[PDB]
Design a protein around this nucleic acid. Structure first.
Ligand SMILES: [Ca+2]
Ligand SMILES: [Ca+2]
Ligand SMILES: [Cl-]
Length: 592
DNA sequence: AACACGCCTAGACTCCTCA
DNA sequence: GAGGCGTG
DNA sequence: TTTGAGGAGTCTT
């Protein structure tokens, strides 16, 4: 089986064995999946090749697949019988036949049918052919017959069966996505990936019925379209699309299904239509801000912050952003102070957005403009250091240069991993708690790299006594214990796809063992507590470098900065917090 | 010099059709 | 979201 | 005529 079919069969098996997910398919749709498994390998191979391509008519001219068969005529015929794949005889709409033809093929057609401009562009010829065929039905039937003859043998994928596989992938996709935005990396690799072993346990339903899923899926397409508009810098298209989404979401706000969604725990409530429209409303405030409609942007941010149902984790980003627009763009210092107060009060705002609001506070208590207002009332200081480059040493990064400085300054051993180094160690020390039994709805299918609550407050609370026991054990751990825990997870789990664990991060198991030994129990314990407590807001801002001396076991955690980049809020909080745990932290600056 | 802010980024590549 | 570049 | 920017396709055993 080649990579594309391997990946497809994994996706299918994973979703079908899920009884509760299969409630969202009528018995005919389940029949189409049964029909696919009754196909030959070559039938399956070819269908997947066409499934991955644009939903459009394809000339058998253009269909080459050496690894399937030399001629695909019997393979197409199997898929035709099964009802997966139309042929010439089904191609009847004139618009569709004209699209399928080449510019020279339409030119010679336009000569025979005496069009006004036979040397015109394809679309003009197509629009012209459609006008003629409409006006004079008799001619239209000749155009259709003439076009189909030039078109030759061609084939299209049936939208009915396609839609069943689209929905299977949509259900499969939910659990692969840890962050917000078949996909390429999975299409290629998914067949070969071995996943952590855990116990699937589904107490709760995500979608009420088939109609609920279709409305989710539609909002997903709308979210996808809005992002693509913003990506291509078509900010007017995006505004209307976001306005359509706001209308479509407004129409739906009464529907009974939404009341079941409100009752889902946050780690499942992400997989609900209302969450997707809320995320579209986050994209809307982004578009309004780019079009300099800051009054309009602030209404939507106030609207979003007025509820706690959908995207609580985004509230930190919303408050910080509301404070900015009221302060710098609208110049309303009285709302700014209220916004910041309500912001800093809210226990959903964390780390960078917490600090950023507090930094905007100390900028107003020490500002002549806000003397007419009341009193209006931190981070620890860190050793900054400077070195020099030309960058070359031949061509090197800012981090590679700093590593050589720490190598010359005695630290023979070093890793430039940013957040992956502590994330992997966190994954390696707490694997068995990460994938532990007895939390319902967190393991729903066989291809998860994480429990669905990992990036939620639920993760720590749901595992509170087990984590506290391990966190304390790690704090009081001799190097023999740390080396043994890392070794246990390594030898049992090496290669297993876990979101937290980059297996290639450490050059060997020995390097992982050597590093935890230098870091020590108290440091590792505190890092693991933070990442377990609130991965969503503590994942980012860990320092670029760990450097350590292989004899002394002196180590520095270093955030490398080039000429023009300051500490982010999340970086300076991590430096302070690693200093409190009693590790030497440094900002290694670089200059020309 | 520093700092706060807006803005853009989005995989890497082949091949071939047609403005 | 995070990072890189340009602006005042 | 002559051509190259953009879109569809492809990627891992
Ligand atoms: Ca690090
Ligand atoms: Ca850096
Ligand atoms: Cl991006």
């Amino acid at each position: 089986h080649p990579y594309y079919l391997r990946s497809f069969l994994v996706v299918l098996k994973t979703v079908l064995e899920n009884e509760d997910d299969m409630l969202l398919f009528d018995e005919q749709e389940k029949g189409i999946v049964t029909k696919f498994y009754q196909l030959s390998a070559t039938g399956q191979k070819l269908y997947v090749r066409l499934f991955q391509r644009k939903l459009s008519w394809i000339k058998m001219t253009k269909l080459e697949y050496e690894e399937i068969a030399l001629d695909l005529t019997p393979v197409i015929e199997e898929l035709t019988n099964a009802g997966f794949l139309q042929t010439e005889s089904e191609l009847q709409e004139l618009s569709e036949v004209l699209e399928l033809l080449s510019a020279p093929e339409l030119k010679s057609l336009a000569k025979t049918f005496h069009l006004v401009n036979p040397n015109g562009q394809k679309q003009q010829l197509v629009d012209a052919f459609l006008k003629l065929a409409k006006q004079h039905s008799v001619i239209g039937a000749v155009i259709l017959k003439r076009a189909k003859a030039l078109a030759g043998q061609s084939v299209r994928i049936c939208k009915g069966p396609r839609a069943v596989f689209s929905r299977i992938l949509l259900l499969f996709s939910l659990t692969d996505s840890m962050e917000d935005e078949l996909s390429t990396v999975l299409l290629v690799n998914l067949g070969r990936m071995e996943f952590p072993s855990y116990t699937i346990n589904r107490k709760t339903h995500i979608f009420q019925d088939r109609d609920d899923l279709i409305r989710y899926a539609a909002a997903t397409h709308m979210l996808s379209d809005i992002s693509s508009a913003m990506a291509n810098g078509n900010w007017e298209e995006a505004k209307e699309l976001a306005q359509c989404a706001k209308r479509d979401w407004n129409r739906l706000k009464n529907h009974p299904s939404l009341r079941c969604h409100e009752d889902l725990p946050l780690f499942l409530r992400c997989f609900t239509v209302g969450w997707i429209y809320t995320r579209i409303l986050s994209r809307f405030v982004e578009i309004l801000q780019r079009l300099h409609m800051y009054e309009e942007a602030v209404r939507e941010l106030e609207s979003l912050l007025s509820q706690r149902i959908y995207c609580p984790d985004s509230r930190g980003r919303w408050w910080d952003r509301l404070a900015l627009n009221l302060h710098q763009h609208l110049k309303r210092l009285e709302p700014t102070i209220k916004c910041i107060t309500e912001g800093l009060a809210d226990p959903e705002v964390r780390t960078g957005h917490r600090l950023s609001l507090y930094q905007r506070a100390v900028r107003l208590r020490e500002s002549p403009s806000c003397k007419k207002f009341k009193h209006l009332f931190a981070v620890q200081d860190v050793k900054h250091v400077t070195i020099t480059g030309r960058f070359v040493m031949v061509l090197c990064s800012v981090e590679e240069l700093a590593l050589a400085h720490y190598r010359r300054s005695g630290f023979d051993q070093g890793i430039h991993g940013e957040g992956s180094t502590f994330s992997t160690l966190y994954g390696l020390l707490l694997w068995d708690i990460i994938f532990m039994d007895g939390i319902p709805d967190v393991f729903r299918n066989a291809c998860q790299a994480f429990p669905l609550d990992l990036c939620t407050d639920s993760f720590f609370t749901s595992r509170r006594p087990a984590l506290e026991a391990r966190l304390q054990l790690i704090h009081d751990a001799p190097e023999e214990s740390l080396r043994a825990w890392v070794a246990a997870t390594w030898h049992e789990q090496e290669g297993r796809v876990a979101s937290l664990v980059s297996w290639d991060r450490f050059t060997s198991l020995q390097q992982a063992q050597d590093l935890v030994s230098c870091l020590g129990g108290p440091v590792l314990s505190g890092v693991c507590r933070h990442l377990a407590a609130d991965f969503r807001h503590c994942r980012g801002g860990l320092p670029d470098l760990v450097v350590w001396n292989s004899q002394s076991r002196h180590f520095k955690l270093v955030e490398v900065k080039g000429p023009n980049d300051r500490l982010s809020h999340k970086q300076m909080i991590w430096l302070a917090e690693l200093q409190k745990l009693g590790a030497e932290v440094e900002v290694c600056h670089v200059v020309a």
